[PDB]
A paper describes a structure:
Among these, group 21 allergens including Blo t 217, Der p 218 and Der f 219 identified in B. tropicalis, D. pteronyssinus and D. farinae, respectively, are known as mid-tier allergens in the allergic response. The structure of rDer f 21 adopts a bundle of three anti-parallel α-helices similar to the group 21 HDM allergen Blo t 2116, and group 5 HDM allergens including Blo t 514,15 and Der p 512. The crystal structure of rDer f 21 revealed an elongated dimer structure with molecules A and B interacting in a head-to-toe orientation. Helices α1 and α2 form an intermolecular anti-parallel dimeric interface while the C-terminal α-helix (α3) is fully exposed to the solvent.
The structures of rDer f 21 were obtained from two different crystal forms grown using either PEG 400 or PEG 2000 MME as a precipitant. The similar dimeric form of rDer f 21 protein crystal structure grown from the solution containing PEG 2000 MME, rDer f 21PEG2KMME, was solved to 2.3 Å resolution. This crystal contains four molecules per asymmetric unit, which represent two dimers of rDer f 21. Although the rDer f 21 protein structure crystallized with PEG 2K MME as a precipitant neither shows the helical distortion nor binds a molecule of PEG 2K MME, some unidentified weak electron density was also observed in the cavity. Furthermore, knowing that only PEG 400 but not PEG 2K MME can fit within the cavity, we further deduce that a molecule of a size similar to PEG400 may exist as a physiologically active molecule for Der f 21.
Residue numbers in the entry:
A (entry chain A): 3 to 117
B (entry chain B): 1 to 116
The structure:
């Protein structure tokens, strides 16, 4: 890929990694949606085990997302990015930030269940 | 909430399971990419193309950054206080696998930089 293109991934690892990130992102979103459903069950049952297990899964997703965030922020700062690339890294950052926010919202709710 | 906290033979957490499968796939991909870059290093040896050299370095640098991140992450998971045997085995193996890949990357980088 010429260094001069502005409309594509110029590096093969960049493309491969975005692609790994996006799949991971949709999976996490889906897991969060499943945990929301489980929070609704928790609301009714008050099961200490469900509560604990939801908290554990939220903590692992959070850790992973904090890791991806750090990685993507750094990539966004690169000095050699074309517009396409910088856009993509910046959008990944925002997407992670929203997911982290949603996790933390759900965590608050779960902790608040009186089991 | 399903898997009992006393299982020793399986992932007890859904996100652990999900991310680890996703990690193994990625490792194989990175391995294949390193293999492709080695091939390209051989071409570089003959042609001495500055652009090929620069591009291989760039890709190596991106793969290294990603692998050092994954290494930090996996080391940390391996230090969890609540792991069963199956989980610890998996995290610890992931850590070793990442280390080997990082070493291979760095070896390839040395060779590339040495192309005049």
């Amino acid at each position: 890929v010429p260094r001069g293109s502005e409309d594509k991934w110029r590096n093969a690892f960049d493309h491969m990694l975005m692609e790994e990130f996006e799949e991971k992102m949709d999976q996490i979103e889906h897991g969060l949606l499943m945990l929301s459903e489980q929070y609704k069950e928790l609301e009714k049952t008050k099961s200490k085990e469900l509560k604990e297990q939801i908290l554990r899964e939220l903590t692992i997703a959070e850790n992973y997302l904090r890791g991806a965030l750090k990685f993507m922020q750094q990539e966004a700062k690169r000095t050699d990015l074309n517009m396409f690339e910088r856009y993509n890294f910046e959008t990944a950052v925002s997407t992670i930030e929203i997911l982290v926010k949603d996790l933390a919202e759900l965590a608050k709710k779960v902790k608040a269940v009186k089991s």
